[PDB]
Structures are given as structure tokens and as C-alpha cells.
Amino acid sequence: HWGYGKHNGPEHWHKDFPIAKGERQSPVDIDTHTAKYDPSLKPLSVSYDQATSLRILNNGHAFNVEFDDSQDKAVLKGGPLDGTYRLIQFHFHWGSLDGQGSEHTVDKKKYAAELHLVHWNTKYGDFGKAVQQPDGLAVLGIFLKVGSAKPGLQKVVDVLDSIKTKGKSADFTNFDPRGLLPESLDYWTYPGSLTTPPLLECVTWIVLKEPISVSSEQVLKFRKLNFNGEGEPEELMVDNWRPAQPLKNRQIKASFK
């Protein structure tokens, strides 16, 4: 099975998931000079006040903080989106070094990590149906650079010792995802895909211009996770990012000029 190693990493995924070579694959490089400012883009509406986190899970590729998505508690609307998308989970991708780790790049620049807040279009009833649809998901992507700590991330960092290995989960209630958001909600947007298998072309990507800063110690704790299950040989969970894919005939739009 697929992963991020030398024999099963991103360049291998197309053998099991042929859509890996598709027409709207993610991530991509965001060339900020070819991005098109679109005055008709609405501001993003992020309504996380009622969010209910439930638990945190090491799935062998990243860790997911999962939310109750059985009601409109934490929703994303506006921006390029029609209708309401519900937060189901967030996770991150990160590097072995501070100089790499993000999936999207900005003018070929790589950030230390990238946060994905995953939301599904409520008109499809649940996440499983939504991923089968071209407008099924909206993923809000936020870059992390290494600098000052992000206090709102610390509760995530502190529980990672409880989920070191693949398949481990821990109760993780009352986490407020608003503490992971940068000041500005200026964004780029383009149609794309999940960045891990099954690589389905179901995502409206919304990538924030402004990164959040996290401390070196915070991202180091990410790197102490393991891809392997307990009692298997230890392989650090680092470099769990897919590289940029061809833009093909897509234009990236910007909400700001």
C-alpha cells in the first residue's frame, strides 16, 4: 500500500489510483503573478463557534482531528462556494526539515507544513457521498511557517504522545479550530483533488494567503510521530506531502489584488 516512502510514495500512486495523472490534481504551485484577481469572489465565511471536536487519530499517513458533522456546527460558506460545507476533520502535512512540508507552494516556495480543514457540501448528505462529486468538498489550506508559537495549536501538539503510531486514537474534545486561523482570510482558489489516495477530483481548494507561524518545538513534535503501527519498525512520520502537480487547464483565482 501507498505511502510516502521510496517504493510507495507519490510517484507510485498512479498504479493503484490512475486519476493521479488526471486533469485537476492537487496540490499545485500557486504562481501569484499568473493568479487572476476576481472581484466577484465573496469573502470567506468561516463559522466555527459551535465546532465540536471528538477525537484525534493517527491514520498512518497523518493525524486527523475529527469533528461532529451531523449538524451545521462548523461550516464554511461564501468565497467561491455555493451552499454550505461542513467541517469533518483537519490534518496537516509536514516536512523532515523546516524548509519543506507544504503541499501547495507559493511561487515555488515551500512552507514547513500545511493545515487542511476539510469540509463537505451538505447537499450531498455525508462525506462519503460528497467525495464522489466534482463540488463535494471544500478544503481550506493554511500554510505554517516556523517562527513564534501558535498558542491555539498547543493542545494538538500535547496529545500527539497519545497517538504516536498508526491506528491510535484519543479523545479530543473542545478544541477550537479558530485558534489555527491567521488574521486575514484573503485566499486563492482553484478546482482540484484530494492530495492522498483515492485522489478524487472533488475539491474546491481555498488556500489562505497569510501563513500562521508555529514554533520550531511545535513542528518538531509532529516529526516524532510514526507512520508504522505499534510493534512494527519505527519510521518517523515526516515528509507526508505530495509534490505540486501540473496545473493543466486551470486558472487560480485570487480574492485580493
Ligand SMILES: NS(=O)(=O)c1ccc(O)c(NC(=O)NCc2ccncc2)c1
Ligand atoms: N489532503 S486533503 O486533499 O485535504 C484530503 C481531504 C480529505 C480526504 O478524505 C483525503 N484523503 C483521504 O482521506 N484518504 C484516505 C486516507 C488518507 C490518509 N490515511 C488513511 C486513509 C485527503
Ligand SMILES: [Zn+2]
Ligand atoms: Zn491534506
